[PDB]
Design a protein around this ligand. Structure first.
Ligand SMILES: CC(=O)O[C@H]1C(=O)[C@@]2(C)[C@H]([C@H](OC(=O)c3ccccc3)[C@]3(O)C[C@H](OC(=O)[C@H](O)[C@@H](NC(=O)c4ccccc4)c4ccccc4)C(C)=C1C3(C)C)[C@]1(OC(C)=O)CO[C@@H]1C[C@@H]2O
Ligand SMILES: CC(=O)O[C@H]1C(=O)[C@@]2(C)[C@H]([C@H](OC(=O)c3ccccc3)[C@]3(O)C[C@H](OC(=O)[C@H](O)[C@@H](NC(=O)c4ccccc4)c4ccccc4)C(C)=C1C3(C)C)[C@]1(OC(C)=O)CO[C@@H]1C[C@@H]2O
Ligand SMILES: Nc1nc2c(ncn2[C@@H]2O[C@H](COP(=O)(O)OP(=O)(O)OP(=O)(O)O)[C@@H](O)[C@H]2O)c(=O)[nH]1
Ligand SMILES: Nc1nc2c(ncn2[C@@H]2O[C@H](COP(=O)(O)OP(=O)(O)OP(=O)(O)O)[C@@H](O)[C@H]2O)c(=O)[nH]1
Ligand SMILES: Nc1nc2c(ncn2[C@@H]2O[C@H](COP(=O)(O)OP(=O)(O)O)[C@@H](O)[C@H]2O)c(=O)[nH]1
Ligand SMILES: Nc1nc2c(ncn2[C@@H]2O[C@H](COP(=O)(O)OP(=O)(O)O)[C@@H](O)[C@H]2O)c(=O)[nH]1
Ligand SMILES: [Mg+2]
Ligand SMILES: [Mg+2]
Lengths: 429, 441, 441, 429
């Protein structure tokens, strides 16, 4: 019951998911080969949320791996956990995407999406009662942006009542390593609007800044950035797998995080995050966890929530803690900071409290915020897009692959419209 | 035989029932595997387990309860846990997805798929009864299963049975503390079945029990396991005179004759007076006089409310233990002497005394003390309308902008039902303005 | 001596008989090599093995059964298996090719080649009888041997014997689940002998027993070995009062006097009420009252049917074990009280109670539990016509295009016999419309 | 009882049957010399279905080997199992067939068929009660097409009530290695119509595609293609040899697979088929076996059943499995896919369940389908035939051997007629 299909697409989405299937596979005691070596009986009662049981008490993840280039598939097989996945879910072409949205959404992605959805329906039709999906991808590439939003817009035509959410990486102007990333991100925010139930927007500039300032890492790699993201992805569906005092599924969050539809772009966040050495100096309590989840420098999206108002937030606590301190600290924040919360919604905060903390610490927490300050993201893209497109720069790599300009200007205008949807619900009483 | 059916709906409804069915197993001397121990060659029905436990032959006591949830997770704590062969396997009913804080899912989409399975199980317990008293529905206003499914079930239980009493033990939303953002939409929509189908609805909330744990009991950091043991002492005292001997016993119908004036004036708040920690239970004078005054105190309420802002209409004093009735009349006449406590001008015989012999049971690992005496006070007052005005205002804020409405309409209900249930609760609040005021010519 | 001849035709008919002849060997204490053990210097006919087992001299018990199949494969599991010297070698009759889902082969081409050999063996068992009661023919509607051969045999058994009762225990085709594509052609053609030659025909189907195993018994994945043990408990209870002592014993002819109104109204559906797994057989109240209600439940039927859509005409309650008759009358009068259970308006004495002392036997490796009490309910109702309308519709689809007809015509029958057997079953379905309706002037 | 005479003819039919008598001879524990070395007592109770017992507990197969060229006979004798067959059943001429239908059906095949049928009647007259026959041959050669259909049309004159079925290889336009194969296949489909009770049509393009995609073989040989075909041929007559819970003979299938006569062309299929390595990742259960038997890429005929409707199918399960899961999974397919089944026949599927799985795996299955989509085969031949014959290409190699054009145009028209017999029973209510 309540299964989750995982569709990691591209280079960035596969690197996150390969680190994601190393955290979940530690929470349930899965061996790198696939056997079970846990000690708690709760690690198997809801292991079918992610893992199909196979012959001889081996546990195969319900993950589908997509790329348009065989190289990242060869890395994941040859990594620590290449043994864990099933070899029939490594779907890949040969000709690369080009960091091009059109080449992965129209020419060479539509050729492949028949051979991917036929594998998606092998996972979904074997489940007892499927709950939803999850994409891990990257707004800014060819396969994560283009091929990811072709996969999305072909599942809502077949599974039109399941919770589909994405853990998508959005670009930032401070950290660029792709010239054409505004074209590739605007054309996929337009798809994420009409097709997705929750969208956990993540940046990379926000993830070095957590590693630099909070974690005090000296040389961060991508393995450290994906390690933060994978701690969020496990934290959201915790009450789905472990028993709690309050429970919150994927659908239960989406009911009371999303006031109006089309406003489904969330800011994730994790707590505790300390440096090594400075963990003997922090006492672990509920007022300690709450201060990290609402400080701006512990957001995995490069924004400041002081430039807006939280519509709604959610806080998922994991550990043997009380319920008064959860219900009081989540109260003492939205009265001390009542100018940073929308006042036509009383009690903007949802508390979820599980019973099982992670396997090395007590009392973790996860912050998920629906803030109006996320228009800072969509305007930094829609200023770069409208500065290139007004000169039609780098455009023949898109119009040569089947597209035309009418798809651009529509996608630019739908990005600029939802900026004026968080703007209305920020201000005006 | 004075039998009662307990119905536990949703996560809060199940998780209170873990605290209730812990307690009756201790009051009657039943091991967690349903067994009474071998040192009882006495009257079991003279200890009267037979209102909460049907005796299976060959020495086995299975409860008269059904745990329903739309989520598999909460009832699987009862399988195993410790009560894994206390309950019959077919009276622990799980769905596959919860209603997920959505009244329209619990009442229309998901709830109709197990409603035939729940009702068919209640008939198998209704047929085992000889002298069925009524139903004990536990839920929470402000869930999806606690509100949507319970509204679906109380419609069907009124058609099949009707003449039986159907008591509700709800958890009402607290004014400052809330855990759900859509918590006010699910409470206006459960208003219709609570006033129409139930016969006596109780309300508690978590803030008013947090304060009792912190002040009267000195627990610095309560969990829900601390709170539900306090709900269970209210229930264990209310249904006590069904199943223990005592002077002045009170059936479940002698409440409603003496507590409910008019058929829409049936929302009484409960208290419980000796909530005293075991260290503070020394230095005590826990007599009949001090325990009667504590129920009328506005700080010891189980609802965030103040009965000095409205007038009482009836009370119902239920005492357990070392209680002599002449001590009670000397304590009533002090309560009627005080001018802080306003009765209405059509009451004049104030309220009803029930007394029982069986003193309360101390739960091992519990927070309470071992007292000789305890009082539950069920009492109608006009001050419970003030808790309703604090929640209409939260509904009227969010529904002014039609915020979370698109989740509810796309699951099986219409936009127009919000405007009917808002008027429906505004009519009760007009009834309490018109029942409290004395009449002239 | 109250002897009965069991006839097991086809693969389903043999394979039920493996589950029946397992059970009587345990009820009477007979080892699989036909031997009663040496610790019985008592009345064997006082335990009355002598309705299913003719006692060969020098201590040997050989059954009163004949296994017939047109296929060699199924009866060769009985040679060897474990019952390889329980049965006489000449009463296990195999053909060489099966009828192969073809009524015309089982009735005309292949069936006439062994029909003289089968009938000659029945006379050698009919001559060993003193007080022969009747025949117990087991088959399946929707085979070739179960339908074609059994139609051939029941013609010949009516000419030789006639006055004897001839009970049938058929397996009827299920509405959604089917295993044969030509399953409806072989069921319309067996209609003629089932109503004309048998005297009381029973029907079961595999879906309605799959659901009982999954819901009442919590078997997740049943096989046919699970199901045929449930058929065998119906048979072991029906023929029980022939061979055990008890108050209110019922012969096989006291059914037909009390169950069959008119000579074409002889198709009663059976149930069996305590189908309870051994873990669920704790937490039990398996009294006379609860086991009487379960037979009238529309979910516990052995046929995919709903007796709330038609009216009952008779019932026949057969109880085994720790049963006192005053408990039965208090349970009947609750059944007549309910308005969901509609009797007809020419019944008024509702139905017949039989009681037996011998409690049921738990098969080792079985799925059932060890109960004190059990009830088979044979009951005529007008709702069995609805199972027939769901199968006429499948026949009327395929025979509209004359699909599989060329296999049947080229084996020994004509095209015109389809149009006679379709009208013949449509006349029974007109009889149940005209027997259920009360009369006015 | 219920014996089977096996008449393998030609090169392709002998190579399949030589691999076929190595699978059956493993199922019954037959030594390569012919002795018995089994361990289960069920391997001998019905061994007379295929094997005559000879002197000294040796078990000789009831197979008759036909060729018009001595070379393939020399290969089978010198193979692994040349010791197993009787040397009086190696019937062969000297002058080859020419990949010519006329030369093997009229000139040099009719000269030999007297010396073959006289050997067929030595096998058939010694049986207790013979059930039927089986040809293994090849539509596309000289001996498999021509000589095979002369043998067939001379047994129905003598054994006119026995189940004769063929396991015949049909050509495909994607894989050609014979120029005149449309002439040789159209002239033998015309014979298979009026003379055969079941016809299991197999392609080679459908058998590489199983080896490439499903089995993940790198270098498939003919020994791999015949290994698949031989697993079908054993699977069909399983309930004839081993005890089961439901039984299904050759005649029992033909009753309820063939609605109207002349519609007797079946699509075979086998399950499970995994790659090596990816068998620790698949759990073996009845919903797992059912998904392979109805996927299009596990058909041994190069067709897609989505271009038609199954008239009837059959599923023969081998193993200790339940009967509810068989009766429910065969139900959950023909309701989910009710637009792919003919709706004037309720319950198109026949279930057979044996008790004995193959000797290396539990729970195998065999899919046999009577689909209307087999007109895709007969039109791809009847377009090539009518493009050569309208110019009378390669015709004097046929009219020189006794034939004339009147045999062609009749055989072309009977192929084109049964295309309009699956077409009527596909559509029109
Ligand atoms: C002695 C001690 O207590 O060490 C802690 C520790 O020092 C700190 C600094 C840990 C440490 O984490 C990091 O330094 C880190 C590295 C890359 C990316 C993100 C974090 C720790 O490495 C991480 C490790 O986390 C876990 O064990 C969790 O179960 C975590 N597991 C993983 O991420 C994981 C890592 C490798 C392999 C498999 C899983 C987790 C969190 C959420 C959901 C699932 C799992 C913990 C508590 C510690 C160390 C070991 C130093 C912190 O992180 C986490 C995720 O707990 C960083 O800030 C927190 C606070 C912890 O106190
Ligand atoms: C460790 C293990 O379980 O190995 C399996 C195996 O890995 C797989 C992949 C086997 C393997 O089969 C093939 O790779 C194959 C090769 C050529 C042609 C067809 C198949 C296997 O070789 C085949 C072999 O099959 C049998 O043993 C059956 O009895 C089979 N026998 C033969 O075909 C046979 C082969 C050589 C000599 C004599 C007989 C059979 C099937 C139907 C009817 C009669 C017999 C099995 C289960 C396996 C191996 C050994 C790897 C698979 O095939 C079969 C027929 O079972 C291919 O897909 C299935 C799934 C199996 O799991
Ligand atoms: N007193 C008390 N209240 C609880 C408890 N658990 C949940 N609640 C209250 O119940 C409210 C929400 O109802 P839930 O029980 O969580 O949800 P539900 O009724 O099961 O329906 P779903 O939302 O579908 O799960 C919360 O606001 C809590 O205040 C508990 O154990 N004790
Ligand atoms: N309950 C039950 N039903 C069975 C069993 N075996 C077969 N059936 C049913 O019988 C029907 C077909 O009849 P079979 O017994 O298989 O065939 P037959 O009567 O022996 O006649 P043939 O077809 O010639 O073999 C199937 O549709 C099954 O539903 C069994 O063991 N138990
Ligand atoms: N957080 C994170 N970001 C990555 C990783 N790999 C690549 N990226 C970012 O993803 C962006 C481009 O997406 P890419 O991985 O190239 O997707 P693709 O080309 O479509 O497969 C670049 O700006 C990178 O900074 C990774 O492992 N972790
Ligand atoms: N599957 C399979 N096909 C074969 C084999 N040998 C030949 N063929 C095919 O059979 C077709 C011709 O049939 P052939 O064997 O030449 O028959 P013949 O000349 O009449 O004896 C060719 O297209 C080959 O592809 C084999 O061992 N297996
Ligand atoms: Mg819940
Ligand atoms: Mg048979």
């Amino acid at each position: 019951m309540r299964e989750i299909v995982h569709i990691q697409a591209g280079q960035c989405g596969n690197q996150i998911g390969a680190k994601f299937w190393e955290v979940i596979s530690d929470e349930h005691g899965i061996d790198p080969t696939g056997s079970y070596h846990g000690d708690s009986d709760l690690q198997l009662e809801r292991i079918n949320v992610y893992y199909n049981e196979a012959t001889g008490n081996k546990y195969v993840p319900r993950a589908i791996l997509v790329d348009l280039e065989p190289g990242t598939m060869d890395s994941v097989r040859s990594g620590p956990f290449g043994q864990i996945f099933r070899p029939d879910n490594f779907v890949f072409g040969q000709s690369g995407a080009g960091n091009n949205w059109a080449k992965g959404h129209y020419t060479e992605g539509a050729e492949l999406v028949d051979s991917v959805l036929d594998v998606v329906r092998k996972e979904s039709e074997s489940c007892d009662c499927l709950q939803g999906f999850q994409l891990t991808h990257s707004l800014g590439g060819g396969t994560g942006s283009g091929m990811g939003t072709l996969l999305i817009s072909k599942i809502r035509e077949e599974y039109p009542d399941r919770i589909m959410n994405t853990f998508s990486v959005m670009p930032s102007p401070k950290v660029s390593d792709t010239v054409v990333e505004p074209y590739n991100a605007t054309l996929s925010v337009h798809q994420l609007v009409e097709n997705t139930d929750e969208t956990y927007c993540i940046d990379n500039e926000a993830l070095y800044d957590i590693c630099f300032r909070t974690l005090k890492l000296t040389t961060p790699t991508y393995g450290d950035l994906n390690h933060l993201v994978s701690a969020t992805m496990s934290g959201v569906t915790t009450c789905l797998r472990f028993p709690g005092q309050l429970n919150a599924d994927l659908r239960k969050l989406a009911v009371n995080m999303v006031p109006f539809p089309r406003l489904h772009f969330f800011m994730p966040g994790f707590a505790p995050l300390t440096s090594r050495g400075s963990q003997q100096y922090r006492a672990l309590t509920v007022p300690e966890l709450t201060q990290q989840m609402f400080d701006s420098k512990n957001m995995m999206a490069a924004c400041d929530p002081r430039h807006g108002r939280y519509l709604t937030v959610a806080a998922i606590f994991r550990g043997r803690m009380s319920m008064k301190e959860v219900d009081e600290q989540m109260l003492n924040v939205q009265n001390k900071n009542s100018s940073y919360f929308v006042e036509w919604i009383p009690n903007n905060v949802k508390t979820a409290v599980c019973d099982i903390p992670p396997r090395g610490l007590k009392m973790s927490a996860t912050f998920i915020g629906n803030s109006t300050a996320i228009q800072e993201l969509f305007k930094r893209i829609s200023e770069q897009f409208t500065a290139m497109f007004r000169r039609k720069a780098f455009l023949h790599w898109y119009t040569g692959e089947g597209m035309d300009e009418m798809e651009f200007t529509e996608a630019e205008s739908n990005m600029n419209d939802l900026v004026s949807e968080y703007q209305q619900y920020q201000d005006a009483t | 035989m004075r039998e009662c059916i307990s119905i536990h709906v949703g996560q809060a409804g199940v998780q209170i029932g873990n605290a209730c069915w812990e307690l009756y197993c201790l009051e009657h001397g039943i091991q967690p595997d349903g067994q009474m121990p071998s040192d009882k060659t006495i009257g079991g029905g003279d200890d009267s387990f037979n209102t909460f436990f049907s005796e299976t032959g060959a020495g086995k006591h299975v409860p008269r309860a059904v745990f329903v949830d739309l989520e598999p997770t909460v009832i699987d704590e009862v399988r195993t846990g410790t009560y894994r062969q206390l309950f019959h396997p077919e009276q622990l009913i799980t769905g596959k997805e919860d209603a997920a804080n959505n009244y329209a899912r619990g009442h229309y989409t998901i709830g109709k798929e197990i409603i035939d399975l729940v009702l068919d199980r209640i008939r198998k317990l209704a047929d085992q009864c000889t002298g069925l008293q009524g139903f004990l529905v536990f839920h929470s206003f402000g869930g999806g299963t606690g509100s949507g499914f319970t509204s679906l079930l109380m419609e069907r239980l009124s058609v099949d049975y009707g003449k039986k009493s159907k008591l509700e033990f709800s958890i009402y939303p607290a004014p400052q503390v809330s855990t759900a953002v859509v918590e006010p939409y699910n409470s206006i929509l459960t208003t219709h079945t609570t006033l129409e189908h139930s016969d006596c609805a109780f309300m508690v909330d978590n803030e008013a029990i947090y304060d009792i744990c912190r002040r009267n009991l000195d627990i610095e950091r309560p969990t829900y396991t601390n709170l539900n043991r306090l709900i269970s002492q209210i229930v264990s005292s209310i249904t006590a005179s069904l199943r223990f001997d005592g002077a002045l016993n009170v059936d479940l119908t002698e409440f409603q004759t003496n507590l409910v004036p008019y058929p829409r004036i049936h929302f009484p708040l409960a208290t419980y007076a000796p909530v005293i920690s075991a260290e503070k239970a020394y230095h005590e004078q826990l007599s009949v006089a001090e325990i009667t005054n504590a129920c009328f105190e506005p700080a010891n309420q189980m609802v965030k409310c103040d009965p000095r802002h409205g007038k009482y209409m009836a009370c119902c004093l239920l005492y357990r233990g070392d209680v002599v009735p002449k001590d009670v009349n000397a304590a009533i006449a002090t309560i009627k002497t005080k001018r802080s406590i306003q009765f209405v001008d059509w009451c004049p015989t104030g309220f009803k005394v029930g007394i029982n012999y069986q003193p309360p049971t101390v739960v091992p690992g519990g927070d309470l003390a071992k007292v000789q005496r305890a009082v539950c006070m069920l009492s109608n007052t006009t001050a419970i309308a003030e808790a309703w005005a604090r929640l209409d205002h939260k509904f009227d804020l969010m529904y002014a902008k039609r915020a979370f409405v698109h989740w509810y309409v796309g699951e099986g209900m219409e936009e127009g039902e919000f405007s009917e249930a808002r008027e429906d609760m505004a009519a009760l609040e007009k009834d309490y303005e018109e029942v409290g005021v004395d009449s002239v010519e």
